[PDB]
Amino acid sequence: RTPSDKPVAHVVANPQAEGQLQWLNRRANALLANGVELRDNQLVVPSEGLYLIYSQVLFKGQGCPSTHVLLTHTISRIAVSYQTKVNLLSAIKSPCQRETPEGAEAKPWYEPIYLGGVFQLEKGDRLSAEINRPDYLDFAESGQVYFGIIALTS
Amino acid sequence: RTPSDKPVAHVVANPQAEGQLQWLNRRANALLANGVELRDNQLVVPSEGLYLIYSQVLFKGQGCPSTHVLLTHTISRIAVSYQTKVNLLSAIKSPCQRETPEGAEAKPWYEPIYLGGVFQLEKGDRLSAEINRPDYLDFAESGQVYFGIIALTS
Amino acid sequence: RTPSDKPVAHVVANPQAEGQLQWLNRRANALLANGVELRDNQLVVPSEGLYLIYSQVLFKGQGCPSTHVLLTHTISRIAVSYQTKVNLLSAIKSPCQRETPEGAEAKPWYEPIYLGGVFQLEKGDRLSAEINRPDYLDFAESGQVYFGIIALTS
Amino acid sequence: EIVLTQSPATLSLSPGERATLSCRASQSVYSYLAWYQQKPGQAPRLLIYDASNRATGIPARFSGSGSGTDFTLTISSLEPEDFAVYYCQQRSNWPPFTFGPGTKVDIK
Amino acid sequence: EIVLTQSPATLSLSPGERATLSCRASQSVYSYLAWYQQKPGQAPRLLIYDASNRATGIPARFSGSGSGTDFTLTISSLEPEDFAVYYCQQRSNWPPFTFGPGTKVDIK
Amino acid sequence: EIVLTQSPATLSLSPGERATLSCRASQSVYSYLAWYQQKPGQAPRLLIYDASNRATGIPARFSGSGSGTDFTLTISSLEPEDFAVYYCQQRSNWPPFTFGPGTKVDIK
Amino acid sequence: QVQLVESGGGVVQPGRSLRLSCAASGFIFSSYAMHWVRQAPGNGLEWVAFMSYDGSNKKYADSVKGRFTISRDNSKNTLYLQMNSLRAEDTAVYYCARDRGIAAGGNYYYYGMDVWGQGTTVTVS
Amino acid sequence: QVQLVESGGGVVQPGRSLRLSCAASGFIFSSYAMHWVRQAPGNGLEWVAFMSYDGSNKKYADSVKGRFTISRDNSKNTLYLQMNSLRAEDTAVYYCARDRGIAAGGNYYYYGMDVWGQGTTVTVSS
Amino acid sequence: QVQLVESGGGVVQPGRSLRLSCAASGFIFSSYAMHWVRQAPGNGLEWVAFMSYDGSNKKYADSVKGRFTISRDNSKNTLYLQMNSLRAEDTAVYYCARDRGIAAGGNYYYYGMDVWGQGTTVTVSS
C-alpha cells in the first residue's frame, strides 16, 4: 500500500502444483494489494472503475496424441449475486494437427497465450483466468504463467 | 464514468458482419466514453496525451489452400496534419506450412494476434486496427476480437 | 521530452542493425521521457512505483534447418547494486517441427512473441528485453519489434 | 443476403466468336467464385475455381477473371461442344453456396 | 505424492467367471493410466492404455474403465491362460510411472 | 560492411602433413560460414557448411571449426588430390554471400 | 474409377419422406466434404445441403431447413440425405458432389465441387 | 522381428558397478523413449528410469537417484543402465521397454510400454 | 544425373548485352534457390546474384547492381542471367549453383551451394 492506493493484483501459477492451475501471490515480483482478494482461485474486485486485465499461460507438449488437442485461455467475470459468467477475454490455439505416427519422434512444442484489455468492473466481481487442458500447462520457469488486474480509475 | 475524467474506448467486432471487420460499441463489456469517437470504423482521439493502445484478432481456417497465407494485424495512426497511415503496431503469422493434399482432411486451425503499446497522441488523431484477410476472421465468440485505447496522462 | 512528468518509454529495434537487437528512440512514435534512461541497451527506471512493462518481437525464417529452433523472448530486471537478473516475463515458441526436406521449397514463416505485465520497480532498476536468436529477428517494417514501460503510480 | 446476377440471360453466337459471360454479386465476395458448365442431360462440370483458376482437363479457351463484385468468363473461340448452360457460384456463407441464374449459349 | 492401491490382493475364480479388478489413486491422474498383465515367468504385457483403450492384439474380453482417481479392469470370461498378475501404472510425474501393488489371479 | 581475410595466401606443405587454413571476418557472422574447394580445371566444390558440418561425399580428413570472427579448416593429412584452392564464404547479408580471397595449398 | 453413385429417389405423395443415398468409390471418401445440389424441371441449380469430412459443420438452404438432414457413413463410404414432409417445390433431380472442404473462417470455401453423381429424380405431386 | 534383447546381469557385490544393455531390432529405435523397470524376487514391478528419444528428458526413481544413469546409443540401437553404488535392495530382474514418448506438459504420458525385453537377472550378494 | 548445364558465353563488345542460361536436370529445380558466381582469369571467386525458389527474393552484388538481372523459368527448369552494359571487369567464367534457400530472418543462410555447373566463359573484348 506504499503505492497510490490503486487496487492491484499480479498472481502467478503455483510451480509446486501437479497438473492443475492454482493462482498464488506470495512470490518475488507478484503482488496483491489495496482490496483485491483471492478466493476460490478467483480475483475479487474491491472498487468500481476501469481495470486493465491481463494474463499469460504457457502450454508445452511432446508429440501429438490421436485425439485432437485444443488450447483455450479465457478470462471471465461473475457479478455480485450472479449465476452466469460473461467472458471478457478468450483465445484459441491448435498446436496438434495430426497424430504423431508410430516410428516418428515425439518432438516438443511450445504454445503461449496472452490476453489483455480494459474493462469496467463493479465492486464484488469475481474474475477467473481459466484454461481447458491443465495437463498441458508449463510452469518450468518463473515468469511464464500469470494473471493480473490493476485499476486505472476509481 | 469515473472521478478523474479520462478518454477510454473498448470496441468489439460485429458478429453480424459478413466476412468483414466492423467495430461496434454495442454489447456487454464494450465501452466508448469521454470524448473518444468512432467514425468510419476508426477511433477518434479527443485529447493530447499518453495512450495505451491494444487489439486482438482471432483467425480460423479449415485446411490450407495452394497459395501461401499470411495473416497480418496492424494498428495505424492518421495525424491531423500528416499525409497517410503510420503503423504503430503490427504482427504477422503464417498458419499454413503447406497445401492440404488431395485425399487429406481439411483440419481446423486457430491463430490469435495481440498488439499493445503506449503512444503519445495529439488531439484529433485517427486510429485504425486492420487485418489483411477479413475472410479468415473468427468472431464466433464474444471476447475474441477487440480494439481499445485509454489515456493514461490527459 | 516532458509531457506530464510521468515516467514513460517506448523504444523500437534499430532497422539498420545487422543481426543484433539495439533499442532506439529518436523515431516518430517512439518516446523516452520523464527520467527514464537508455544505457547499455537497457531501460533505467527513475522512480519507484508500479510500471506497465511490455515488449513484442517478430521472428522470420525461410524453411527449417536440421537443428531444432527455439525462439525465446524475455524481459528481466536488475536491482541496484545487485548482481543477478530476475526474469519478469518470458515466452517460448517452436516454429520448426521437422527439417525442410531436400526437394521441398523453403517457405517463409513468421512468429511473434508478446509479453506484458505490471510490476513494482524501484529507482535504479535496469530492465532488458532480450532474445536468444537475433539472427531470426525481423524489423523490416515499423511496428514489429518494440519494448516499453510506463509508470502507473508515482 | 447476397444476390447473383448473370448477363446476358441468353447469348446467341456463331462458332469461332468470343463469348463474354458476366456474373455480378450484390456485395463483395472476394475471389470465392466458381464457374460450372452443364450440358443438356448431364451433371454439372467444374470449369473455373477461385475466379481465375482453370480446372483440370479444361480446354485453354475458357478463362476466368474478376474479383469482388464483378466476374467475367471468356471463351476466346466458341466450339460446337461449348453450347451449354453456364452457372457462377459464390462460395460465401450468406447465403451459403448460392448458384447464379445461369446463361445459355446457343447457335445463331 | 500419489499412492496407488490395488484391490483385491488375491483373486481366486473358476474359468468362465467375470473378474473385476480395482486400481485407485490418491490424487487425480485424469485418464493417464495403463494396465499390464504378467504371466508367471514372462515380461509384463501391455493390456490397457489411457484408461479405456485396448492395446493391439488384446482379446475383447479385457476392458478398462474409470477416470480421475478410480479405475477398473474387467475380464468378462476367464481363460486358462488369463491366470496371472495384473498391475496398473499411473503415468503422471509425481512420482513418474508408478506401478500398483498388483492383483494375483488364480484358479479354483 | 564485412571484410573477409584468408591466411595464409599460399600454403606449401608435403603430402602427409597437416594443413591449417584461417578465415577471419571483420564482424561476427555466428556460424554461417562455408568452405569450398576448387581443383585445377573444375567448378568449386562444397566442403564444409555451417562452420563445422562436413558435406556429403567429402573425405573425413577435412574438418571445420570456429565461430563468430575466427574460422579454421584443418586437413589432417594432405593427399595429392587435396592440393587446390580453398575459399571461405560468409553467408550473411552485409554484403550477401561474400567469398574470401582464397588460400592456395601447393607442394613447393 | 473415381465415381459417385446415387439412389433412392422416386414418386412420393406430399408430406411423406424419402431417403437419398450417394455411394462414393475410387477416393478417400472420409477426407472430403459433401454437397447436395438439386435442379427443378426446367430451372437452374439450387444448392441444398453441405457437411464437412467429419460432420462438424453442416449447412442447409433456407427452403429445406428443418425438413432435410444430411449425414454420412465413412465405413460404408456413403452420403445420405433424409427428406421429410416433401412439398411440390422439392420435385427435382438431386446430385451429390464432393468438395475439398478447404475454407477460411468457415465462411469462404476455396476450389469447388469437382466430381458429381449421376443424379436421382424425385417427383412429389 | 520387433524385439528387445537384454544382457549384463549377474552376481555383484555391494558398492560395485554394473552396466546393463538392451539391444533393439525391428523398429526405428531412435524415435522411441525407453524405460528401465525392475522386479525384486517375489515382489511386484518397480519403475526405475526413463529417457526420451534423444535423451533430452531423463527421469529416475528416488531409490536410484544419484546412483543409476540411463543412456542410449542410437547408432547401435542400444539402451544402457549404469548401476553405481550397488545395494542388496537392487537385487531384481531388470526389463527394458519402449514408449512412444508422446506427453502433455512433460508430465503426463499417453499410451504405454508396449514391447519389453526378456529381462536380465541382477543379484547383489556379498 | 543431377546436373546444371550453363551456356551462352562468348566474346562480347563493351556496352552490349548477353543472356546466360543454366538448364537444370535430375532434381526438383523449382524447390531450390539459385546463385550466379563468377571468376575472373587468375582471380578468386566473386558472388554475383541470387534468387529464391519463386523469385520473391533477389540479391545482387554491388558491382553488378543495376546492370544484371537474374530470372528463372520453372517450366523449362532454367535459370537466366541478363547482362547489360558489359564492361571489362565483367570478363570471367560464370557458374550457376543451387542452394536449399534455408535461412534465418532472410539474412543468414544455412548449408551452402552444393552442386555447380561446368561454367561458361564470358570475355569482353577491349
Side-chain angles (χ1 to χ4, degrees), chain D residues 28-30 32-34 36 38 41-46 48-50 87 89 91-101, chain G residues 35 37 39 43-47 50 59-62 95 99 101-102 104 106-114 116-118:
Chain D
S28 175
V29 78
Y30 302 129
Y32 297 91
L33 182 123
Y36 298 86
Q38 189 181 35
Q42 289 189 335
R45 174 155 161 250
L46 176 62
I48 303 295
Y49 66 91
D50 286 305
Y87 301 89
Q89 180 195 33
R91 297 173 62 86
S92 73
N93 196 24
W94 319 265
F97 303 113
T98 282
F99 283 102
Chain G
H35 296 259
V37 167
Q39 180 178 34
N43 195 329
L45 295 173
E46 177 182 13
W47 173 86
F50 161 84
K59 296 178 182 184
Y60 297 99
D62 287 331
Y95 304 92
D99 193 320
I102 304 179
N107 294 321
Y108 300 88
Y109 285 70
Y110 296 80
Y111 308 117
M113 307 152 56
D114 60 329
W116 301 57
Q118 84 285 359

Side-chain angles (χ1 to χ4, degrees), chain F residues 38-74:
Chain F
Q38 189 180 34
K39 298 177 183 178
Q42 289 190 336
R45 172 157 161 252
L46 176 64
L47 287 185
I48 304 295
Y49 65 84
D50 287 306
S52 302
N53 296 137
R54 180 162 34 249
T56 167
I58 299 303
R61 55 183 181 271
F62 295 95
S63 286
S65 66
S67 65
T69 52
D70 281 17
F71 304 88
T72 305
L73 178 71
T74 296

Side-chain angles (χ1 to χ4, degrees), chain C residues 26-136:
Chain C
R26 311 193 187 193
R27 323 200 85 198
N29 304 281
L31 40 81
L32 182 67
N34 304 326
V36 182
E37 298 183 2
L38 201 164
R39 298 186 178 277
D40 304 322
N41 207 36
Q42 298 177 318
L43 289 182
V44 185
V45 172
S47 301
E48 178 179 14
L50 293 174
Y51 285 72
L52 174 62
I53 308 172
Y54 63 86
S55 172
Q56 176 186 285
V57 294
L58 190 71
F59 303 97
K60 184 191 179 178
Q62 283 83 8
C64 287
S66 58
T67 28
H68 211 45
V69 175
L70 266 60
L71 306 174
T72 79
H73 186 34
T74 308
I75 295 180
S76 57
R77 163 185 171 256
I78 304 182
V80 295
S81 66
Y82 263 62
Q83 292 147 359
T84 78
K85 68 174 59 186
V86 180
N87 289 341
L88 289 183
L89 305 170
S90 180
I92 313 176
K93 282 191 173 181
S94 52
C96 279
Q97 309 303 320
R98 54 159 192 170
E99 169 190 5
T100 300
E102 286 184 89
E105 307 165 354
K107 295 188 168 61
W109 52 263
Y110 302 74
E111 288 280 16
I113 296 185
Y114 188 96
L115 300 176
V118 181
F119 297 87
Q120 168 81 28
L121 298 42
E122 290 85 12
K123 176 179 70 182
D125 293 350
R126 290 175 293 162
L127 274 48
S128 62
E130 306 180 9
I131 59 184
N132 66 321
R133 296 298 299 268
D135 43 334
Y136 276 97

